[PDB]
Structures are given as C-alpha cells and as structure tokens.
C-alpha cells in the first residue's frame with residue numbers, strides 16, 4: 001500500500017568518502033523506519049531503527065537521519081564491508097513494504113572494455129544448436145549495450161547477458177553476450193558482428209568472424 | 215435516481231460532493247459496537263494518512 | 268550537566284526525586300504500542316502492585 | 321540467544337505447496353511475532369504474513385490474498401509456512417526473522433531484529449536433466465571457455481586446470497532461459513603468448529553427476 005522509493009538506485013564512491021542516500025515515501029510514515037545492509041548471498045543486518053537509533057554492536061558511523069517523509073542516511077568512513085546493497089523498510093501500517101535497493105561500490109580504475117569473439121566449434125555442430133558468444137571484459141561501469149548487425153537487421157531478443165560482481169583487484173565487470181541459434185538460421189545470414197557502447201574508449205570496436213571456417 | 219431531474223437550470227449533480235462512509239459506533243450498551251453508514255459532504259471530512267480512510 | 272553548576276549552596280541534585288514514567292498508546296498495527304514519556308516527581312506517583320508499575 | 325534455522329523440503333513441483341518450517345533455538349516465540357520474508361533474485365524483498373506467539377492469528381500480504389496459511393503449535397520453537405497454488409514466479413530466498421518484542425520507543429514493533437539463514441528455492445518442471453558440456457575456441461588477447469547446458473540442479477563447479485584459479489577467472493552467474501534448463505558459461509583470460517603449447521584442462525564437475533570431461537582450446541584455420 002505504501003511505496004518507498006530510495007535514491008540513488010546506483011552510486012559509487014571510493015574509500016573514506018562521504019555518501020548519502022534517501023528513502024522518500026508516498027505517505028507519511030512518522031518516524032517509523034529501518035535500514036538494512038543486505039550483502040548478496042546472506043541475510044540482511046539491521047543498522048537503524050526508528051530512523052535515528054543506532055543498533056547495538058553495529059559500527060556507530062551509520063549516522064542516520066530524516067523524519068516525516070524524506071528520510072536520509074549518512075556514512076562518514078567506508079569499510080570494505082560498506083559496499084553492499086542497502087534497503088529501507090517501514091513499519092507504520094500493514095503491509096510492510098521494503099525499498100527498491102540502492103547499490104554502493106568502489107569507483108576507481110576507469111578503463112575501456114575489451115571485446116572478444118568466438119565462433120562456434122565443430123563439436124557444437126554435432127548437436128542441433130549453435131553456441132556463439134561475444135565476450136566483454138575489463139570495463140567500467142556496468143551498463144553497456146551490445147549490438148548485433150545481422151546482415152544489417154537486428155533480430156533482437158537472443159542476446160543474453162550475465163555480469164559478474166565488482167572486482168576486488170581493478171574494479172571491473174564481465175558480461176557474457178551470447179546468441180544461441182540453430183543450424184537452420186545461423187548459416188542463413190552472412191555477418192554476425194557484435195558492437196558495444198562505452199565512454200572510456202574512442203570508437204566502438206567491431207568484432208566478428210569470417211563467413212566459413214572461422 | 216430519476217433521469218431528467220427537471221433540467222431547467224442544468225447546473226450539475228451532487229456526485230463527487232458526498233461520500234458514503236461506514237464507521238463503528240457504540241450502541242446504547244458500552245460493550246456492543248455496531249457498523250453504520252452515513253452520507254457526508256466532502257467539506258465535513260478531512261483525509262488523514264492512509265488515503266482510503 | 269555542567270560540572271560547577273554554581274556550587275555555592277552544595278545541597279544536592281534533582282535526581283532521586285524525579286522519574287521517567289512511560290505509558291502505552293495504541294497504533295495502527297494490531298497488538299502494537301508506542302511508549303509516551305514524561306518526567307514525574309516522586310510525590311505525584313504511587314506504586315500500587317507489580318513493582319515498577 | 322535467539323537463532324532461527326530452517327530446512328524445509330527444498331525444491332518442489334510447480335503448483336505444489338511449499339511447506340517451509342523454521343526452527344527456533346535458544347529462545348521461544350511465547351510472546352514475539354514471527355515473520356516470513358522472501359528475496360527474489362536481485363530486485364528487493366517482499367513481506368509475507370505474520371504469526372503471533374500467545375495466540376494463533378495470521379496476517380497476510382494482500383497480494384497473496386488467499387495463498388498463505390500459517391501454523392503454530394504447543395511448544396514455541398516450531399512454525400510452518402504453507403502456500404497454495406504456488407506459481408512459477410516464486411523463486412526467492414525465504415528468510416525467517418522475528419519481530420522485536422520490546423524497544424525504547426514501543427512494544428511489538430515489527431522491524432526485524434535477527435534474520436535466519438533461509439534457502440534459495442526455485443520452481444520449474446522438467447527438472448531432472450544431466451549437464452551437457454561444450455568447449456569454446458577462437459578461429460585465429462583471446463580466451464576460451466567451457467559451457468554447461470541443460471544441467472540440474474545448481475551449482476556446477478568449474479575447475480580451471482585444478483589450480484589455475486588465480487587470474488582472469490570470470491565465472492559468470494548461471495542463467496535461466498525459457499526452456500527451463502540452465503546455461504552456465506566460463507572463461508579464463510590468457511594472453512596471446514601461450515596458445516597451442518600449454519594444455520588448458522577444464523574439469524567442470526556437477527556434484528550429483530560428476531561430469532568429468534576434459535577439453536582444450538584449438539585454433540583452426
């Protein structure tokens with residue numbers, strides 16, 4: 001019944017920065033609110049209750065604030081465990097709707113994506129399927145659009161994506177852009193080139209394979 | 215309601231001015247509550263939180 | 268408090284004479300209560316039964 | 321202290337009841353309220369109905385208007401969550417958290433103090449299927465890979481040379497397609513100076529099947 005919208009849905013900062021979040025409500029929830037630090041793969045850990053009362057045991061740098069409808073959270077120092085998904089929850093009246101979930105990550109080592117291409121192997125032809133993938137590596141930030149000019153026409157929908165989490169060495173990601181087809185359609189068209197979009201690079205690098213044995 | 219309503223002035227219609235609100239009151243006995251309905255003009259009722267109340 | 272407190276009389280402090288007293292108020296969610304706080308002098312409250320009440 | 325651990329059945333057939341049971345250890349819900357929270361992949365968290373300890377009373381999210389049913393028993397360490405007509409969009413990590421019984425600012429405030437461990441449940445028909453391994457190889461910095469298709473269930477370990485888990489190992493998250501059978505890609509980043517000489521053995525293994533298959537990258541021209 002009550003929709004909580006938290007902003008920004010994606011933000012990145014380095015070690016020891018000053019980070020702020022907001023969780024705006026559509027109805028007045030008084031001072032009833034709770035904040036969580038839900039690392040993926042594990043249960044969330046409570047941080048704030050009643051929108052300003054720090055929980056016991058948790059680090060006391062989570063100087064929460066906000067009252068009424070505009071609720072905000074502030075962090076002074078950043079630990080390695082700070083970078084995780086945050087959720088804002090209300091408990092004013094039923095139902096107990098949660099928040100969308102903001103993200104905090106390290107923002108360092110800006111670089112350009114490395115585009116790869118791998119035409120399907122011969123033993124993938126033994127089965128009635130085609131497995132061709134255009135790999136993306138060493139890029140920042142996460143968002144990127146991969147285009148596939150199939151003879152100049154984009155048969156969109158078959159471009160699957162799978163991004164690994166933030167890196168602990170050079171702070172990058174890795175998307176697996178693949179288009180799984182069959183033998184009756186893969187051999188029909190001529191060119192299968194994957195083109196991506198990014199800001200750190202100069203020109204979108206086109207990667208493809210020669211029509212035939214490659 | 216009647217349809218033509220003697221539309222000589224043709225000013226409007228009282229819908230979107232009244233609300234048909236139900237609430238729980240107490241009868242002549244304190245230990246008994248009854249649910250009753252009433253028509254209230256929109257100028258007599260204020261909308262608190264939980265907009266459907 | 269401040270430290271000196273203008274310690275000319277050196278009599279005492281208002282603690283052990285005042286108390287927090289807090290009491291329930293009902294809320295929207297069923298079986299949920301909010302505590303309302305106040306400071307009351309010991310001369311205005313009496314302990315009936317079930318100590319700390 | 322209070323510890324909440326739940327095992328339940330696990331994976332179940334579509335359109336079948338998910339009777340998850342949460343175990344309370346150390347404490348007891350003699351007066352507190354127990355709640356169920358499920359976490360979809362990504363996205364956020366959706367609150368499921370609530371149960372009291374002194375009395376048997378069940379709340380429910382209006383979205384799940386009639387699908388939910390809860391039970392409590394004599395001892396206050398056993399609790400069961402019952403869902404009816406469970407659809408195919410009910411994959412989540414069903415948590416188990418208890419409401420705060422008292423606080424400086426109120427009583428029985430429903431903000432979850434201690435969570436449980438939960439379990440990542442998924443629902444799909446045509447479940448049982450053995451993994452199928454495909455290799456990856458360019459035609460002419462490059463990389464290789466070991467794709468695993470139509471495997472069940474999660475997960476499938478990807479052993480890169482059984483000791484080469486050091487650099488460029490971008491094991492991507494598993495993906496689910498419309499066919500209901502998962503696809504999992506793999507890669508290890510290698511430069512263009514050790515190609516065609518050193519074998520890149522890729523011993524991808526699935527725990528219930530042990531799909532020990534050996535493969536290497538080849539450059540064909």
Ligand SMILES: *[C@@H]1O[C@H](CO)[C@@H](O[C@@H]2O[C@H](CO)[C@@H](O[C@@H]3O[C@H](CO[C@H]4O[C@H](CO[C@H]5O[C@H](CO)[C@@H](O)[C@H](O)[C@@H]5O)[C@@H](O)[C@H](O[C@H]5O[C@H](CO)[C@@H](O)[C@H](O)[C@@H]5O)[C@@H]4O)[C@@H](O)[C@H](O[C@H]4O[C@H](CO)[C@@H](O)[C@H](O)[C@@H]4O)[C@@H]3O)[C@H](O)[C@H]2NC(C)=O)[C@H](O)[C@H]1NC(C)=O
Nearest residue numbers: 289290291300320348349350351373374375421422427428
């Ligand atoms: C602001 O509001 C808050 C909340 O509203 C309020 O705090 C509450 O105050 C009330 C009244 O003092 C408390 O109610 C008591 O609850 C006791 C716990 O009951 C549970 O446990 C019973 C037994 O299991 C436990 O037994 C012992 C007890 O100590 C324990 O060690 C064990 O480990 C075990 O866990 C259990 O039987 C009971 O369930 C019964 O009751 C319900 C409700 O009636 C009934 O439906 C069930 O079928 C079942 O019969 C429950 O699960 C309880 O012991 C205690 O009972 C005494 O009082 C009754 C009634 O007066 C008498 O008949 C008798 O003397 C009993 O001994 C009583 O019910 C409640 O727990 C507080 N809530 C808190 C603290 O969160 C504040 O006071 C308010 N602020 C103010 C007033 O300033």
Ligand SMILES: *[C@@H]1O[C@H](CO)[C@@H](O)[C@H](O)[C@H]1NC(C)=O
Nearest residue numbers: 215216217226227228229230
């Ligand atoms: C009520 O008022 C509206 C407002 O114009 C009008 O359109 C309608 O005909 C009136 N009568 C009924 C029965 O709705």
Ligand SMILES: *[C@@H]1O[C@H](CO)[C@@H](O)[C@H](O)[C@H]1NC(C)=O
Nearest residue numbers: 236237238239247248249250
């Ligand atoms: C009146 O009380 C009954 C039972 O107590 C309840 O079902 C109904 O929703 C109430 N109506 C209101 C509060 O308008």
Ligand SMILES: *[C@@H]1O[C@H](CO)[C@@H](O)[C@H](O)[C@H]1NC(C)=O
Nearest residue numbers: 268269278279280281282283
């Ligand atoms: C108040 O007076 C008492 C006298 O026993 C003293 O011990 C205490 O330090 C004083 N201050 C406070 C804050 O209690």
